Amino acid sequence: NNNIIKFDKARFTVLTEHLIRIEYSETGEFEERMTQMVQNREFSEVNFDIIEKEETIEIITSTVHLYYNGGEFTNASLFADVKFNFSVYSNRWYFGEKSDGNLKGTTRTLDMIDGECPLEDGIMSKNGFAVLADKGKVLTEVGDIAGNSVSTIDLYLFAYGRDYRQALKDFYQLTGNTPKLPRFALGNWWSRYYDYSDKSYLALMDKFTDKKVPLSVSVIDMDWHKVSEVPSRFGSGWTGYSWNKKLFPNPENFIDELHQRKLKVTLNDHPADGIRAFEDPYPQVAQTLDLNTELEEAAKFDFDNLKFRKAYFEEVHGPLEKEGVDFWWIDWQQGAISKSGVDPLWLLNHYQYQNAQKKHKNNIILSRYAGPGSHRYPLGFSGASVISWASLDFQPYFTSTASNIGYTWWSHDIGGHMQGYKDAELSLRWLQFGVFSPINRLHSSKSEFTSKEPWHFDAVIEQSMIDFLQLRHQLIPYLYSANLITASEGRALVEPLYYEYPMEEEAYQHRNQYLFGEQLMVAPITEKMNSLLQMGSVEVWFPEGTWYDFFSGQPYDGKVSLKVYREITEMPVFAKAGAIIPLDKNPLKKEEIPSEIIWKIFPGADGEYLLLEEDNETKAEFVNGIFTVTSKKESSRKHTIIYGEHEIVSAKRGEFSIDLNGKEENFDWNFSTALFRRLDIAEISYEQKDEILQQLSLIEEHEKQVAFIKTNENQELQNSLFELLYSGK
Amino acid sequence: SLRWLQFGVFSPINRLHSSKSEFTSKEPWHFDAVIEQSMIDFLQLRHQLIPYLYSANLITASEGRALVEPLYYEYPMEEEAYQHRNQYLFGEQLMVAPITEKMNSLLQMGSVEVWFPEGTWYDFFSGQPYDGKVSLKVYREITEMPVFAKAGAIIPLDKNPLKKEEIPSEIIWKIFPGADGEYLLLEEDNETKAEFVNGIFTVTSKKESSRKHTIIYGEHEIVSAKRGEFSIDLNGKEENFDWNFSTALFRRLDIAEISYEQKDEILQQLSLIEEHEKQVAFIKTNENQELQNSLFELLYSGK
Amino acid sequence: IRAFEDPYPQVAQTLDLNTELEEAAKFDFDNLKFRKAYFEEVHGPLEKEGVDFWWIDWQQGAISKSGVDPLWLLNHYQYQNAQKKHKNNIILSRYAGPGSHRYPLGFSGASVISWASLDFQPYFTSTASNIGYTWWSHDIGGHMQGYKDAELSLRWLQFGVFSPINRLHSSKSEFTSKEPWHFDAVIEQSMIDFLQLRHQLIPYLYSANLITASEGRALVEPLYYEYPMEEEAYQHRNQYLFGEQLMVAPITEKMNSLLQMGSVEVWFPEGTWYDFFSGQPYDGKVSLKVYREITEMPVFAKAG
Ligand SMILES: *[C@]1(O[C@@H]2[C@@H](O)[C@@H](O)O[C@H](CO)[C@H]2O)O[C@H](CO)[C@@H](O)[C@H](O[C@H]2O[C@H](CO)[C@@H](O)[C@H](O)[C@H]2O)[C@H]1O
Ligand SMILES: *[C@]1(O[C@@H]2[C@@H](O)[C@@H](O)O[C@H](CO)[C@H]2O)O[C@H](CO)[C@@H](O)[C@H](O[C@H]2O[C@H](CO)[C@@H](O)[C@H](O)[C@H]2O)[C@H]1O
Ligand SMILES: *[C@]1(O[C@@H]2[C@@H](O)[C@@H](O)O[C@H](CO)[C@H]2O)O[C@H](CO)[C@@H](O)[C@H](O[C@H]2O[C@H](CO)[C@@H](O)[C@H](O)[C@H]2O)[C@H]1O
């Protein structure tokens, strides 16, 4: 109440020094209930100043002057000056107007998108302020829609400057934290829009095992249910709740077989045509909803309706869950229309996520983005992207930017969904990105030609895809720990560079570069390789410090912007001196938590990593060359230590300390080996290869080696050779 | 026309000539004020070089050494001495790399790939330094010619090139710091030896004369119109030319027909970034490939 | 006027601001007391130090309580206030809608430095006479961004000299000074020649100025003012009358390097015309492409 100020028909709540709620009420009553967006307005007390006159009020915090001159809210009556100098004259908010600087957020879907699409604003701005309008309905205490707010205007002014992480934390305090994901969500998912039988689906799952590809999730797409068998008088077979008995004669037994293989099972649900008279559950639903069965009255989709929702969860989903379905893929594409004015997609995500908690702890959905606050209902499902280099090139930027509206669990169709064109290299680059994305779900539309099975491709592509898919399971400990940090501390797994480096202009100029947890920096390659080099490339910004390629140990002295080149089988991922990354030593081994962890240490600085698990916390410390591992609880877990290049300790039990000061710090990576490899794969003249190898071996002074490559007629070859020289300086 | 005259001035004979056209006169004042002034400057330079040329002439006649030598006369075992067709030695003290291609309009500069042999080299005109051995693309405005001298080079010049007199009444001794050197000025009726040994410059002649000697050590005139034989210690005198990275960088960016936003960013980043390797990494990202090469020349000279 | 400013103590006293909370005197040109404090206590001391007139450089939008554009409030009240200390005083400010010609001079602002911007500007300038706004001052040579071309700078200055106002200006770049001696000796000498010509034209300009004020005739007229029934008077966008004695066809395209000359298609009305500079004659009526070296500008005068 000390942090609440009324003036004329407005109410101002100073939630933090940098977050002010702004309300208008014609009725003099202001809204206390939660909304679709807002779950909590309880914040600790803060200091601020007021200048209140007859006709005007000014609220003053450490970061903003908010002015209200009375009357209806207009661009003239309600406005704010930030106490920052990030811009020369973009430091003022005017009610109902847009200002420059917004770093954007996300959008509902990538359905039908070939490359870039427009995004909605987020809460982050380079100029230090953003306004988030609450246009949603009020909730009841139990979380049903209650109707219109009595605050007919309800806004949140964010004035955090470039303290982006704190803005996001306080956003999560206002809108509710992201829930914890279950560990199974972080493994590889198999999905394909393909009319598998029980037999061919299990045969494929057993082929994954034979091929050494680990999976956590078995998606079954819409051909699980009747499609062509639906009489046309009912409409299409898009919506379905009845097994196709030719393909799945015993569904519970088939799901039992996936459960024996330690897979979680989800089915595609297209809800929009509801429960029509041909469906297996229709007799029960018709009885519950008092439908006219002799006129074959449909139970039309109506998620505003309590009785419909109950029948949907209990009598439609319920029997399928009893057969063993673990969680729901809500695949909604039929618009934003409802009686209530609430988006049916929001109603589905809110009510289905809540219903999923009844049968499994920390359960998920898979569904499209439903607006600010819908991060409460993971996972995000971006949908039917066009298969193209342009779509891949948009996706890292899309994924990191989404953290700016707190939606940090986007699952993209890895390799793209539909249409587009075949290029095995595009498929491989997309999988590299997916492995370093929130969720790694392989999926494809209905084409005989778009399977994401590694063995679809040639032996080189296949082996690389298998390697990356195994790496995803090696990363599950790191991902799961980051997941618990999202849930408990409001930190995104994927951060734009500018979260960590807000004052570095280069942190705003590398759209596809991101931080992946706290220990890794990713620069995916999203452009087709230069055939003369047989290598793809990306311009990488290296912050201040010593950086190592995560895979090769190639070093880079920051701060620098440097074009980096990789073969199609290799991905630019970097770790700082002192980085500690845990890996599952046994990624193929079915076990709910790893029996063995590899501690991968990057020499040259102190470091620390906290491994959060379901029932433990394990701290790895690297201080003055001493590596120490301690846990809250004891276990039989065996620890492996890799210090730079070399395995130091193999499968050691319990807590321990070891001195690595007397151990080889340097990786093997060396200029001459790397130079020989780049020249050898290049589709260039042998006389050019001979001369470059000879001259770069003979010329001793680094500045003269660089002068020699500066004369090369191949401009991209110059850049590739320059990367090696820079790493070898 | 201007590039051709630059070459002619550093060729065996500088004879302006043209066929029967009302439009092909080689008079400097045929052209605009910029071209005219540059042509006049080069034509005066030719007469400043007559002492050096005449001495080389007597060396051709008496010792069978050409004034103009291919690089491979001096550097027969260096493959790069066979790969710079238009580069040559001009007497024993100067190495010439004429520009013979129309300028890049985006840079407002012409260029030539120069092979610098082992040693420290200076632009004869600007004092811009180059560490050999290296092959390096060099850029010059249309009024400037790539001519280079080694540390220790001594070049005599006529101080009064316009003055009608059968032999110069005044010689400028132009000394390039950083090494010992020597030059023998052969004339019709004299020989004058200039020696630069452990920072001591000595001038002696076979016969005495009223000739007045001027000494330019790098940048600075040390002695003005001094008669007779003499010695002077230059160890306590400023060795360094004025030429500097920042002034040269500003000039190249300023004449360039490129975006002002690119000029602003290059000047700001190259001033801010302290480590030479990171200044080179910054220019390596430039979308203008020839601008990269021009900036790289400045960075290489400023290393 | 924020709390760090030299005039803030006086403004705070006049407007009863809370100085211990560092309350800003926010810009509010709807407010009589704010306007008075702005003219008397903010501008006033600077005028006492010798400032002759105000460059109002407003780019922060059209929002006010009253629904009056703050730019209109600034131009109306500042032009009126400028008359207090000097006779026939001016401002320099952006266009504020029909009638704002009452508050000269016009300030067109932050043009991109390009051939495209120069090529628009003569047309822009003459067309403005159609809403009576006849004193546009453009940044001569362009304001910001864009690209370097000494010939573009020289052609822009040629136009400026035959425009309502010849104000050299440039944004914050070490590389965009409009000083003639920034350029080579040929460009420098031509720029100096054109800048001296502007002062030679001041008698003609000042006389035209009094004709604008007393008879409502623009200095710069589209061709179709004089030749309303000639279709060619609507087909030469950048050609204009400059007072009553001169017709201008600026060159606004980079020269053809094979000719070492720029060009413009000129419509010559009925009559005998002379190049103002060379005396080259032209028999009207004809449309004729004319060529000039970068140092020369197409300006024409009739017999008599
Ligand atoms: C794609 O699906 C179409 C079908 O609509 C139908 O026409 O058969 C086609 C094959 O011959 C098939 O390509 O296009 C539609 C319209 O854009 C999308 O709605 C489909 O995506 C969604 O549904 C799929 C099936 O459940 C699912 O795999 C996707 O993840 C959904 O986004 C798309 O596959
Ligand atoms: C050039 O001379 C021709 C003349 O032959 C004659 O036809 O008049 C022409 C002008 O309308 C003129 O261009 O071509 C010939 C044939 O190739 C050359 O022999 C001339 O060069 C020589 O003679 C010139 C006159 O003495 C002299 O200046 C040159 O140095 C000579 O090589 C050439 O000018
Ligand atoms: C230009 O000014 C920007 C500044 O805003 C700041 O970012 O510094 C830059 C240089 O590093 C500089 O280029 O761009 C802005 C935004 O478009 C304009 O508002 C500026 O023009 C106005 O202000 C100038 C300074 O008073 C003035 O010279 C112009 O006449 C004004 O239009 C522009 O220069």
Domain boundaries, chain C: 1-215
The end-to-end CA distance of chain B, in Å, is: 35
Written as six digits, the tokens of A244 are 């196709």
Q: Which ligand is nearest to the CA of B20?
A: 2
Experimental method: X-ray
Q: Which ligand is nearest to the CA of A86?
A: 3
Within an 8 Å CB–CB cutoff, is residue B135 touching chain A?
yes
Chains that touch C (3 or more CB pairs under 8 A): A, B
Q: Can you tell me the distance from the alpha carbon of A30 to that of A15, in angstroms, rounded to the nearest whole number?
A: 16
Report, in angstroms and rounded to the nearest whole number, the Rg of chain C calculated over CA atoms: 22
Q: What is the b/e burial string over B151-182, where b = at least 16 CB atoms within 10 angstroms of the residue's CB?
A: bbbbbbbbbbeeeeeeebebbbbbbbbbeebe
Nearest Cα of chain C lies from the Cα of B35 at a distance, in angstroms, of 10
Q: How far is the CA of B27 from the centre of ligand 2 (A)?
A: 19
Written as six digits, the tokens of B207 are 């016969």
Residue numbers in B near C147 (CB within 8 A):
257-260
Q: Which of A589, A361, A327, A634 is nearest to A476 (CA)?
A: A589
Determine, for residues C145 and B257 on separate chains, whether the beta-carbon distance falls below 8 Å.
no
Determine, for residues C146 and B260 on separate chains, whether the beta-carbon distance falls below 8 Å.
yes
Q: What is the dihedral of CA B129, B133, B135, B141, to 10 degrees?
A: 20
Q: What is the dihedral of CA C132, C134, C139, C141, to 10 degrees?
A: 110
Residue whose token pair is 């004025």 = B242
Q: How far is the CA of A559 from the centre of ligand 3 (A)?
A: 29
Written as six digits, the tokens of A675 are 């130079």
Q: How far is the CA of B264 from the centre of ligand 3 (A)?
A: 14
Residue whose token pair is 């599952």 = A584
Q: How far is the CA of B8 from the centre of ligand 2 (A)?
A: 21
Q: Can you tell me the distance from the alpha carbon of A395 to that of A527, in angstroms, rounded to the nearest whole number?
A: 12
Measured at the CA of A290, the angle between CA A284 and CA A295, to 5 degrees, comes to: 90
| Ligand 3 atom at minimum distance from B264 CA | 11
- For A481, the 3-state DSSP assignment is helix
Is the preceding peptide bond at C105 cis, omega within 30 degrees of 0?
yes
Ligand 2 pocket mutation pick from B16, B17, B20 by most atoms within 8 angstroms of CB: B20
Cα–Cα distances in angstroms (integers) from residue C263 to residues A561, B36, C97, C120, C250, in the given order: 45, 26, 35, 16, 9
3-state secondary structure chain C: CCCCCCCHHHHHHHHCCCHHHCCCCCCCCCCHHHHHHHHHHHHHHHHHHCCCCEECCCCCCCCCCCCCCHHHHHHHHHHHHHCCCCCCCCEEECCCCCCHHHCCCEECCCCECCHHHHHHHHHHHHHHHHHCCCCEECEECCCECCECCHHHHHHHHHHHHCCCCCEECCCCCCCCCCCHHHCCHHHHHHHHHHHHHHHHCHHHHHHHHHHHHHHCCCCEEEHHHHCCCCHHHHCCCCCEEECCCEEECCCCCCCECCCCEEEEEEEECCCEEEECCCCCEEECCEEEEEEECCCCCCEEEECC
- Comparing alpha-carbon positions, the chain B residue that sits nearest to C184 is B34
Cα–Cα distances in angstroms (integers) from residue A214 to residues A459, A466, B232, C158, in the given order: 19, 9, 85, 74
The strand pairing partners of C262, in sequence order, are C292
Going by alpha carbons, the residue nearest to atom 10 of ligand 1 is A446
The strand pairing partners of C55, in sequence order, are C92
Q: Which of B108, B83, B80, B2 is nearest to B45 (CA)?
A: B2
| CB hemisphere CA count around A17 (13 angstroms) | 11
- For A112, the 3-state DSSP assignment is coil
Written as six digits, the tokens of C27 are 């810009």
Q: Which residues contact A701 (CB under 8 A, 6 or more apart)?
A: none
Going by alpha carbons, the residue nearest to atom 16 of ligand 2 is B19
Residues counted in chain B:
303
Residues counted in chain C:
304
Distance of CA A313 to the CA centre of its chain: 28
Written as six digits, the tokens of B273 are 């970034």
Q: What is the b/e burial string over A11-48, where b = at least 16 CB atoms within 10 angstroms of the residue's CB?
A: bbbbbbebbbbbbbbeeeebbeebbbbbbebebeeeeb
Within an 8 Å CB–CB cutoff, is residue C20 touching chain A?
no
Going by alpha carbons, the residue nearest to atom 26 of ligand 3 is C57
Nearest Cα of chain B lies from the Cα of C175 at a distance, in angstroms, of 6
Q: What is the DSSP string of A292-361?
A: -GGGT--B---TT-HHHHHHIIIIIIHHHHHHT--EEEE---S-S--TTS--HHHHHHHHHHHHHTTTST
Written as six digits, the tokens of A548 are 């190592």
Q: What is the b/e burial string over A554-593, where b = at least 16 CB atoms within 10 angstroms of the residue's CB?
A: bbbbbbbbbbbbbbbebbbbbbbbbbbbbbbbbbeeeeeb
Residue numbers in A near C60 (CB within 8 A):
89, 92
| CB hemisphere CA count around C130 (13 angstroms) | 10
Going by alpha carbons, the residue nearest to atom 5 of ligand 2 is B20
A residues 51-90 closer than 8 Å to C (CB): 51, 58, 60, 65, 67, 69, 75-77, 81, 89
Q: Which ligand is nearest to the CA of B268?
A: 3
Q: What is the DSSP string of A267-281?
A: EEE--TT-B-TTSTT
Distance of CA B287 to the CA centre of its chain: 31
Counting runs of H as helices and runs of E as strands, what totals does chain A give?
A: 16, 37
Q: Which ligand is nearest to the CA of A88?
A: 3
Q: Which of A58, A38, A39, A40 is nearest to A48 (CA)?
A: A58
Distance of CA A432 to the CA centre of its chain: 14
Q: How far is the CA of C112 from the centre of ligand 3 (A)?
A: 12
Measured at the CA of C204, the angle between CA C199 and CA C206, to 5 degrees, comes to: 85
DSSP A62: S
Report, in angstroms and rounded to the nearest whole number, the Rg of chain A calculated over CA atoms: 28
The response to whether residue B15 sits with its C-beta less than 6 Å from ligand 2 reads no
Within an 8 Å CB–CB cutoff, is residue B264 touching chain C?
yes
Measured at the CA of A548, the angle between CA A547 and CA A551, to 5 degrees, comes to: 150
DSSP A678: H
- For A209, the 3-state DSSP assignment is helix
Q: Which residues contact B20 (CB under 8 A, 6 or more apart)?
A: none
Ligand 3 pocket mutation pick from C172, C173, C175, C178 by most atoms within 8 angstroms of CB: C172
Do residues A413 and A388 lie in contact, with contact meaning Cβ atoms separated by under 8 Å?
no
Within an 8 Å CB–CB cutoff, is residue C260 touching chain B?
no
Q: Which of A182, A250, A178 is nearest to A217 (CA)?
A: A182
CATH of the domain spanning A183-489? 3.20.20.80
Residues in chain A after which the backbone breaks (C–N beyond 2.5 Å): none
Measured at the CA of B24, the angle between CA B22 and CA B30, to 5 degrees, comes to: 95
CB-nearest partner of C21 from A60, A75, A94: A60
Do residues B261 and A699 lie in contact, with contact meaning Cβ atoms separated by under 8 Å?
no
The response to whether residue C112 sits with its C-beta less than 6 Å from ligand 3 reads no
The strand pairing partners of C300, in sequence order, are C247, C275
CB atoms within 10 A of CB A194: 18
Q: Can you tell me the distance from the alpha carbon of B282 to that of A189, in angstroms, rounded to the nearest whole number?
A: 42
Q: Which ligand is nearest to the CA of C142?
A: 3
Report, in angstroms and rounded to the nearest whole number, the Rg of chain B calculated over CA atoms: 21
Cα–Cα distances in angstroms (integers) from residue A183 to residues A382, A479, A591, A677, in the given order: 21, 9, 11, 39
Q: Which residues contact A314 (CB under 8 A, 6 or more apart)?
A: none
Cα–Cα distances in angstroms (integers) from residue A57 to residues A69, A77, A194, in the given order: 7, 11, 63
Q: Can you tell me the distance from the alpha carbon of A256 to that of A252, in angstroms, rounded to the nearest whole number?
A: 6
φ, ψ of residue A40 to 5 degrees: the values are -160, 120
Within an 8 Å CB–CB cutoff, is residue B41 touching chain C?
no
Ligand 3 pocket mutation pick from C140, C144, C174 by most atoms within 8 angstroms of CB: C144
Q: Which of B45, B43, B11, B48 is nearest to B27 (CA)?
A: B43
Residue whose token pair is 């030598």 = B69
Pairing between β-strand A217-220 and β-strand A188-190 as defined by DSSP bridges: parallel
Measured at the CA of A534, the angle between CA A531 and CA A537, to 5 degrees, comes to: 95
Q: What is the DSSP string of chain B?
A: -HHHHHHHHTSS-------S-TT----GGGS-HHHHHHHHHHHHHHHHTHHHHHHHHHHHHHH---SEEEHHHH-TT-GGGGS-TT-EEETTTEEE----S--BTTTTBEEEEEEE-SSEEEETTT--EEESSEEEEEEE-TT---EEEETT-EEEEES-TTS--SS-SEEEEEE-SSS-EEEEEEETTEEEEEEEETTEEEEEESS---PEEEEEETTEEEEEEEESSEEEE-TTS----S--HHHHHHHHHHH--SBHHHHHHHHHHHHH--SHHHHHHHHHT-S-HHHHHHHHHHHHHT-
Q: Can you tell me the distance from the alpha carbon of A667 to that of A720, in angstroms, rounded to the nearest whole number?
A: 21
Written as six digits, the tokens of B248 are 């040269």
Nearest Cα of chain C lies from the Cα of A98 at a distance, in angstroms, of 12
| Ligand 1 atom at minimum distance from A383 CA | 32
Chains that touch B (3 or more CB pairs under 8 A): A, C
Do residues A455 and A462 lie in contact, with contact meaning Cβ atoms separated by under 8 Å?
yes
Q: Which of C43, C44, C262 is nearest to C152 (CA)?
A: C262
CB-nearest partner of A722 from B284, B293, B300: B284
Q: Which of B208, B206, B216 is nearest to B239 (CA)?
A: B216
- Comparing alpha-carbon positions, the chain A residue that sits nearest to B113 is A711
CB-nearest partner of A561 from B136, B285, B292: B285
Residue numbers in C near B254 (CB within 8 A):
148, 175, 182
DSSP A403: G
Written as six digits, the tokens of A318 are 């319920």
Residue numbers in C near A58 (CB within 8 A):
23
The response to whether residue A445 sits with its C-beta less than 6 Å from ligand 1 reads yes
CB atoms within 10 A of CB A206: 12
CATH of the domain spanning C1-215? 3.20.20.80
Q: Can you tell me the distance from the alpha carbon of B83 to that of B102, in angstroms, rounded to the nearest whole number?
A: 21
Measured at the CA of A34, the angle between CA A134 and CA A133, to 5 degrees, comes to: 5
φ, ψ of residue B264 to 5 degrees: the values are -55, -50
Q: Which of B162, B175, B176 is nearest to B213 (CA)?
A: B175
Q: Which residues contact A497 (CB under 8 A, 6 or more apart)?
A: A504, A506, A507, A508, A510, A513, A514, A515, A541, A543
Question: What is the dihedral sign for C-alpha C35, C39, C41, C46?
Answer: positive
